[PDB]
Amino acid sequence: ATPHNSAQVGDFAETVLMCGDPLRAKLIAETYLENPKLVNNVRGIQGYTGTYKGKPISVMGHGMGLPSICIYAEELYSTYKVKTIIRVGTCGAIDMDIHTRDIVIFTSAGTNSKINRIRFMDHDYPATASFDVVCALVDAAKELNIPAKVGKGFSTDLFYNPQTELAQLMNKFHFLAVEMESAGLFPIADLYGARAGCICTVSDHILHHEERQNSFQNMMKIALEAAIKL
Amino acid sequence: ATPHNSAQVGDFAETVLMCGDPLRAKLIAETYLENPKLVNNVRGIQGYTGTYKGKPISVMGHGMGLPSICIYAEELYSTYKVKTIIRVGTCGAIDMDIHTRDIVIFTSAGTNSKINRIRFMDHDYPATASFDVVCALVDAAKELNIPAKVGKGFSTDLFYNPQTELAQLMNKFHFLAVEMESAGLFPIADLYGARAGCICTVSDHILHHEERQNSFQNMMKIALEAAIKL
Amino acid sequence: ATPHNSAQVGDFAETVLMCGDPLRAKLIAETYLENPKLVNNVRGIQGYTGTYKGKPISVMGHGMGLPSICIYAEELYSTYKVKTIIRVGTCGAIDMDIHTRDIVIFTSAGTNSKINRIRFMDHDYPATASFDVVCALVDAAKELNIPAKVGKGFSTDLFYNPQTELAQLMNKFHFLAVEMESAGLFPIADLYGARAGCICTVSDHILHHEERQNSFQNMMKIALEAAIKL
Amino acid sequence: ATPHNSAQVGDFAETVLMCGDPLRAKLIAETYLENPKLVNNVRGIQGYTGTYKGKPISVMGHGMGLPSICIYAEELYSTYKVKTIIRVGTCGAIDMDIHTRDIVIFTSAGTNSKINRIRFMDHDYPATASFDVVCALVDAAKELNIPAKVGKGFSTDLFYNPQTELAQLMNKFHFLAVEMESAGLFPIADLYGARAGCICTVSDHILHHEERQNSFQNMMKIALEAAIKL
Amino acid sequence: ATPHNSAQVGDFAETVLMCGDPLRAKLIAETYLENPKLVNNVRGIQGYTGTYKGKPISVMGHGMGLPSICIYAEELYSTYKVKTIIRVGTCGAIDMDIHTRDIVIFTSAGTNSKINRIRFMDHDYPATASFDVVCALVDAAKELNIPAKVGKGFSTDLFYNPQTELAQLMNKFHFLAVEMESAGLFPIADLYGARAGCICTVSDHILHHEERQNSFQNMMKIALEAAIKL
Amino acid sequence: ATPHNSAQVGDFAETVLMCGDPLRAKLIAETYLENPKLVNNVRGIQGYTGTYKGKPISVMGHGMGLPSICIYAEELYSTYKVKTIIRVGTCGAIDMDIHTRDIVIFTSAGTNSKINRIRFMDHDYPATASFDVVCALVDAAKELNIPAKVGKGFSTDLFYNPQTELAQLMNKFHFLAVEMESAGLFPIADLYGARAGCICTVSDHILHHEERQNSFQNMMKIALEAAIKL
Ligand SMILES: Nc1ncnc2c1ncn2[C@@H]1O[C@H](CO)[C@@H](O)[C@H]1O
Ligand SMILES: Nc1ncnc2c1ncn2[C@@H]1O[C@H](CO)[C@@H](O)[C@H]1O
Ligand SMILES: Nc1ncnc2c1ncn2[C@@H]1O[C@H](CO)[C@@H](O)[C@H]1O
Ligand SMILES: Nc1ncnc2c1ncn2[C@@H]1O[C@H](CO)[C@@H](O)[C@H]1O
Ligand SMILES: Nc1ncnc2c1ncn2[C@@H]1O[C@H](CO)[C@@H](O)[C@H]1O
Ligand SMILES: Nc1ncnc2c1ncn2[C@@H]1O[C@H](CO)[C@@H](O)[C@H]1O
């Protein structure tokens, strides 16, 4: 019922997992959901809804960047009355102690975007992950006993960042990893009194380049279980 | 050879047409190119290369938003040595005299993004379309005798814009239409001494909602011919 | 050994509780610590160190505003090798569902300050509370079974804010309460690979004015116990 | 009928050529217009109106800087119902391939001014030259067969720019030349649904100092003829 | 010896009076200086040097806007080793208690320009008038017993200001009058360890429109005498 | 009658001297005022009112930073109808010619705060000291024949400033000293049609570290006498 979604209210579960890659979503739909049904494929976005441990859960792509994820997340909350959105995906390690394949759970996300300043009267909005979702994720990691780091992430507008010193600065402040959507996502969830969260598997390290599926599967378990808890 | 493209240098034509929808690109690939070959489908992006009037031309999706298109455009220029990128797609009419289905050729694009300020020492960068591409497009429209408006466009970071007064302001300054990529695209082309341009078919009017394929096909002709001229 | 502290390295415990009022700190020192010794009273700041359940703990005032708390927090981390700083105090309720006397635990803090933009290359820094401290506080509340809300806070530079619409905006985004130090505190902790956190008792509601000690004592228990856990 | 103009509605032609130097305008008035009549000399601005190939055309000085040209341009459009303003003058080459005496036709103009952000809700306004005026100028150059470069210009607020790195940055993005008025001019034309344009003769190169009248006369021909076409 | 001045080092007095209008400067040169000699008329700027009470003093136009006055002032300080520049001219009353024809002596000048933020690491630079010049002016007014108000002025980049609420805001903060050069002037004087100052005669009131030469002559006396004192 | 003051309207003199240190205020109260009575000690702020040469005068602490002093100053003007506030204290020398123990009288104060931009529609507000207070202070210094420098000061939000180049920049523009309150103070005085001023004794030099009471006492005399004059 939207310019980017053909699904009707009800086609989506209250809990939706999203990742940038629409093909990764199709994969997750096939691989982890039982009886998954494609509910929306506008712009080949790959929107499915199935079940996990009997619970209804949807998975869909969100593209790259805060602008993209902002369209989808706002529609899902606003139109499809989705209650929870967990962002699963990859990212770039920033902190030196964070290594490739390490799983990271965002508490918050910084950004070089202007979106939040535009929504927050040009002030500093703390793009924070829903504490419930952060707890469910961390609990799920604990229960599964899957090591994972928890802290700040960075949603960059520039994948190829001209400001080469930013990386180092972030390291000094111990930002865990960098991606391109969380910062835009979190505030939207707030606006709708809904919940948002993010957990990514470090695909590489930006401050020095250093089996990769096991990490993805582990991140996916942590996410799926946390969804049940939510 | 990139994190978002599997194609090797050479798989892409010097002139590439891009649109947000990866399915629209597949459609254009099938519909308008002869012997199209999928050169890249990372993130289901839908990258093809074929020929038109015997000339090599590629078509690929670029997602939504300056962050997304910025990744692709930079890689195509930088890695695949693409010389020209024409953005074809839809947009929202802003000016009152601009109506749905009207075809628009961007001279430049404004934005509420921070990307260009980040690349231009926090100054006003005039995200301008390559004059060659603007000429080729306008000439193609003239030759084909297909009416089309030429002027400013707006690349919004917020599809659903909280600043409801912006629309009206843009109308006062006669911005033709609003989309989500041009502003990011144009400066990247400049940086690489390459060429960029945009031509969109107004899918709707934001200041008041007011066969749609004929307009698309007309926009597509104007673009394809302009590519030959380029 | 500083321009604002006479105490020598060692006079402060690894865990320090701070509040704006230097008299409140003296009160907490007397009331909750055993054998408290005034370690610093430069600018009548009221710095004490004593014990709680046998563990060493310091309490000191931090003044009002990010500039003030930024001087103290940086010195404590940098010079006195303090590992944890929990901010205890009052605040103004913003969210409609938050009421006077309700205890609030900050996950993060937004701000209309420029400090963080100055430290973060003019980007959005997510002033986030240390997850360990947020957990210890929430666990302590759970163990003590003392209801408390957890979410975003706002560190205003303007106690008397000229931008009368901000309050309402924050309510729309569900900011829990507003104070004047957290936002400055959190990033400094990050810079020093240390920990920071905040828990305040809502002294009033800014969107409509609506025994007060019981709430303070409850907040104080939650804080003291969380400190032991840390 | 204004604080900066004594001329009454009608004293100015629909097409007005302006340059910073009021003496250059007097020169152009004498040299290129037939039967020129001084219509305004408030602040010795040097406003004339005469004819060229029988068509009415005015020439006047506009001072230096966006603030100055903004006063004049707004009055001419608003009060004297001027339809077209072509800015003729000098500038500093920025691009390495651009040399002294080269004639440049602006497509758009960037700036380190705050004026446009003030008129555009603190967003990036693409100070673009009217496509009609850009075409008329380029056509006139083509018809006259006078080589001229077409691209971005920069309207600096600081002739003596403290940010010594800006120049180099602009070169990387291939800005053609730098002046001090276009950026302010273009948006005003838009606001009045009128037309603006600029064509300057490079008086020097800022990135390395490298008969000068022939270039001026050529630029002047291109401008005068383009005016007839407009 | 500059792009905007033909005079050689020595042609200008250590103390220079400047006003926007080049014709007003010629008038002041003729009217108030003995044996005035035109030292520079590039861009018809009208630069003279003569004597007053036997002391050498120059008068020259500076155009409109911070960009214009910034070129001249920097050259005069830098190249012509001018020690003092007093800005004389007109302005618009802002404060309700300030009336047309009232003479105003600026202590400082605010602005909506970006120039000073560009010179001051994007911080708030207090564009302040040299205390010596402010004293000399106020003393001269006192000695001459010519009533004059002393306080903040505003250097606008937009003579025709789109932000119609600014005026009222300035009134609330009691800004005395608005012009277009001081704010740019003052910081340049600082940079050169030189002196700058401003004294204007209110030509009109912006918050409500309410012999005019007597006021000008009085302002001129105050300025000339203050120059002798300097 | 405020959240930070228990004194009732009348407990404060029309002229109030404030310094960061609440203990310094108590000292000044004891040392320089006759029959001083503590009127407010909320947050141990140390508010006294006594007499000097028979005239009523109050002294109180204001904490550190613009946020802190902004709360107090606004309440004193607004609630306690205070007419004049003179800020006395310490500061850091910036200018090379300014030495430790030198007394400085602020004409204005720059800042890296965002407070004034928040009160001034994101424009440059010239945080200027009341000319009456600047005169009274300078006259008092002259009468007492106590050397003192007069010029720009800087109110930093970051005592420990990350932007290590700022210091040098300020030196180039000849900023006299740096503190943390003036910039916030001055504009508030304006808003209330009241008067504010500042005079500090340089406790150290930031660009190179170089009996200290004599300087303080001298600064205190200058202030007390200026208060009588006011
Ligand atoms: N190093 C990285 N930088 C930015 N985005 C990353 C990175 N690694 C993975 N991503 C994610 O994948 C896409 C960018 O390639 C975005 O969806 C982003 O969130
Ligand atoms: N009205 C509109 N606003 C923003 N983007 C639009 C609009 N219409 C079409 N688009 C385009 O389609 C996507 C947004 O739906 C983006 O790729 C954008 O360029
Ligand atoms: N409503 C409020 N607004 C701002 N600060 C508050 C509020 N309530 C309590 N505070 C706290 O007390 C002081 C402001 O009175 C600061 O230390 C601040 O953190
Ligand atoms: N190099 C340059 N930099 C800025 N302005 C220039 C330059 N060359 C010529 N100009 C023009 O002349 C004046 C500045 O000397 C302005 O009108 C400006 O447009
Ligand atoms: N009301 C006003 N607004 C802006 N500038 C003014 C005003 N009155 C006089 N001026 C001065 O005259 C010119 C603007 O007309 C500038 O030099 C400016 O300093
Ligand atoms: N060098 C300095 N930098 C900042 N503030 C200073 C300095 N010296 C003294 N101060 C003052 O003392 C406190 C900072 O230590 C603030 O009240 C501030 O005004």
Tab-separated table of C-alpha atoms in Angstrom, chain F residues 43-209:
chain	number	residue	atom	x	y	z
F	43	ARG	CA	24.124	24.618	45.696
F	44	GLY	CA	26.593	26.286	48.066
F	45	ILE	CA	26.640	29.111	45.521
F	46	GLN	CA	27.542	31.633	48.271
F	47	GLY	CA	25.281	34.637	47.711
F	48	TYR	CA	25.917	37.697	49.867
F	49	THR	CA	24.729	41.284	50.009
F	50	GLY	CA	26.452	43.998	51.998
F	51	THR	CA	27.686	47.527	51.437
F	52	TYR	CA	30.675	49.311	50.041
F	53	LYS	CA	31.177	53.012	50.684
F	54	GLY	CA	27.627	52.839	51.959
F	55	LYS	CA	26.265	51.491	48.707
F	56	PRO	CA	24.432	48.120	48.557
F	57	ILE	CA	26.265	45.434	46.638
F	58	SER	CA	25.882	41.663	46.294
F	59	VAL	CA	28.457	39.012	45.471
F	60	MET	CA	27.717	35.440	44.436
F	61	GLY	CA	29.282	32.482	42.672
F	62	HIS	CA	28.215	31.577	39.144
F	63	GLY	CA	29.929	28.259	38.537
F	64	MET	CA	31.903	27.377	35.439
F	65	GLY	CA	30.672	27.655	31.877
F	66	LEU	CA	28.055	29.568	29.947
F	67	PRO	CA	25.299	27.143	30.946
F	68	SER	CA	25.893	27.783	34.650
F	69	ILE	CA	26.335	31.538	34.545
F	70	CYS	CA	23.334	31.716	32.200
F	71	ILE	CA	21.006	30.273	34.828
F	72	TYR	CA	22.132	32.697	37.542
F	73	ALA	CA	22.380	35.844	35.420
F	74	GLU	CA	18.936	35.334	33.903
F	75	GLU	CA	17.366	34.828	37.337
F	76	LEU	CA	19.109	37.847	38.865
F	77	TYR	CA	17.992	40.118	36.023
F	78	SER	CA	14.570	38.574	35.621
F	79	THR	CA	13.593	37.790	39.220
F	80	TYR	CA	15.787	39.856	41.530
F	81	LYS	CA	15.672	42.909	39.251
F	82	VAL	CA	19.458	43.242	39.336
F	83	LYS	CA	20.590	46.080	37.090
F	84	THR	CA	24.313	45.397	36.802
F	85	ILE	CA	26.489	42.312	36.901
F	86	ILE	CA	30.263	42.598	36.818
F	87	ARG	CA	32.146	39.360	36.329
F	88	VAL	CA	35.382	39.219	38.322
F	89	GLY	CA	37.757	36.288	38.180
F	90	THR	CA	40.703	34.589	36.541
F	91	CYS	CA	41.480	33.680	32.970
F	92	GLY	CA	44.146	32.421	30.624
F	93	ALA	CA	46.300	34.837	28.637
F	94	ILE	CA	46.254	34.214	24.886
F	95	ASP	CA	47.988	37.226	23.372
F	96	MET	CA	51.797	37.077	23.591
F	97	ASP	CA	52.018	40.644	24.880
F	98	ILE	CA	49.630	39.768	27.720
F	99	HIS	CA	51.396	38.341	30.770
F	100	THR	CA	50.396	36.488	33.919
F	101	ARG	CA	48.988	38.803	36.613
F	102	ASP	CA	48.034	41.364	33.968
F	103	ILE	CA	44.502	42.627	34.567
F	104	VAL	CA	42.113	42.442	31.616
F	105	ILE	CA	38.843	44.255	30.953
F	106	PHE	CA	36.642	42.571	28.334
F	107	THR	CA	35.051	44.644	25.595
F	108	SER	CA	33.448	41.508	24.191
F	109	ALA	CA	33.795	37.742	24.333
F	110	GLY	CA	33.965	35.172	21.550
F	111	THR	CA	32.924	31.558	22.047
F	112	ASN	CA	32.833	28.007	20.708
F	113	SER	CA	29.479	27.608	22.421
F	114	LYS	CA	26.219	27.288	20.469
F	115	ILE	CA	24.090	29.162	23.032
F	116	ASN	CA	24.142	32.542	21.283
F	117	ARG	CA	23.547	31.004	17.842
F	118	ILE	CA	20.537	29.362	19.487
F	119	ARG	CA	19.289	32.744	20.732
F	120	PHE	CA	20.229	34.639	17.569
F	121	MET	CA	18.671	32.645	14.711
F	122	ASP	CA	21.945	30.868	14.026
F	123	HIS	CA	23.716	34.118	13.304
F	124	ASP	CA	26.759	35.794	14.768
F	125	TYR	CA	25.749	37.590	17.925
F	126	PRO	CA	28.401	40.035	19.126
F	127	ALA	CA	28.563	39.152	22.844
F	128	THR	CA	29.481	42.690	23.889
F	129	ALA	CA	30.048	44.116	27.360
F	130	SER	CA	27.878	47.053	28.388
F	131	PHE	CA	29.706	50.242	27.372
F	132	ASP	CA	28.743	51.861	30.694
F	133	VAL	CA	30.331	48.997	32.604
F	134	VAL	CA	33.361	49.013	30.303
F	135	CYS	CA	33.742	52.736	30.917
F	136	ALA	CA	33.232	52.528	34.669
F	137	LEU	CA	35.835	49.782	34.830
F	138	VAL	CA	38.358	51.555	32.648
F	139	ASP	CA	37.744	54.865	34.469
F	140	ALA	CA	38.205	53.125	37.820
F	141	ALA	CA	41.472	51.649	36.552
F	142	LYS	CA	42.558	55.090	35.330
F	143	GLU	CA	41.579	56.831	38.562
F	144	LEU	CA	43.288	54.133	40.624
F	145	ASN	CA	46.092	54.283	38.067
F	146	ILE	CA	46.183	50.476	37.852
F	147	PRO	CA	47.442	49.289	34.450
F	148	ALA	CA	44.993	46.966	32.740
F	149	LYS	CA	44.464	45.766	29.191
F	150	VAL	CA	41.177	46.205	27.354
F	151	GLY	CA	39.945	43.971	24.568
F	152	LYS	CA	38.415	40.706	23.416
F	153	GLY	CA	38.103	37.694	25.669
F	154	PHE	CA	37.063	34.151	24.836
F	155	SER	CA	34.431	32.097	26.632
F	156	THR	CA	35.371	28.485	25.901
F	157	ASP	CA	33.034	25.553	26.407
F	158	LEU	CA	36.108	23.330	26.500
F	159	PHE	CA	38.549	24.276	29.281
F	160	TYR	CA	40.696	21.438	27.900
F	161	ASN	CA	40.291	22.359	24.228
F	162	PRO	CA	40.775	19.534	21.644
F	163	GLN	CA	41.275	22.181	18.905
F	164	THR	CA	44.865	22.987	19.816
F	165	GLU	CA	45.161	25.399	16.880
F	166	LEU	CA	42.427	27.711	18.199
F	167	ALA	CA	44.773	29.227	20.769
F	168	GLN	CA	47.232	30.264	18.078
F	169	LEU	CA	44.438	31.610	15.890
F	170	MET	CA	43.134	33.726	18.720
F	171	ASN	CA	46.628	35.070	19.242
F	172	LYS	CA	46.762	36.108	15.588
F	173	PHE	CA	43.529	38.050	16.114
F	174	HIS	CA	44.853	39.348	19.404
F	175	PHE	CA	42.297	37.885	21.788
F	176	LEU	CA	43.426	38.983	25.221
F	177	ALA	CA	42.404	36.104	27.456
F	178	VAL	CA	40.119	33.092	27.717
F	179	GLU	CA	37.554	32.249	30.398
F	180	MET	CA	34.181	30.455	30.430
F	181	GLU	CA	31.258	32.772	31.160
F	182	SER	CA	31.291	36.280	29.667
F	183	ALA	CA	29.973	35.310	26.214
F	184	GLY	CA	26.897	33.774	27.817
F	185	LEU	CA	26.494	36.649	30.265
F	186	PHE	CA	26.624	39.641	27.921
F	187	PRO	CA	23.739	38.638	25.641
F	188	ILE	CA	21.452	37.906	28.630
F	189	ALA	CA	22.086	41.432	29.980
F	190	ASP	CA	21.062	42.817	26.570
F	191	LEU	CA	17.867	40.785	26.528
F	192	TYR	CA	16.911	42.358	29.873
F	193	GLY	CA	17.945	45.882	28.957
F	194	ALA	CA	20.386	45.556	31.861
F	195	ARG	CA	24.178	45.826	32.116
F	196	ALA	CA	26.980	43.297	32.218
F	197	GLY	CA	30.750	43.506	32.256
F	198	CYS	CA	33.871	41.511	33.013
F	199	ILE	CA	37.344	42.094	34.428
F	200	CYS	CA	39.715	39.205	35.055
F	201	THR	CA	43.192	38.754	36.423
F	202	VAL	CA	45.313	36.508	34.184
F	203	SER	CA	46.163	33.473	36.321
F	204	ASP	CA	48.236	31.895	33.567
F	205	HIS	CA	49.215	31.981	29.906
F	206	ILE	CA	48.030	29.204	27.600
F	207	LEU	CA	50.624	29.773	24.873
F	208	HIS	CA	53.552	29.372	27.330
F	209	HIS	CA	53.623	29.139	31.113
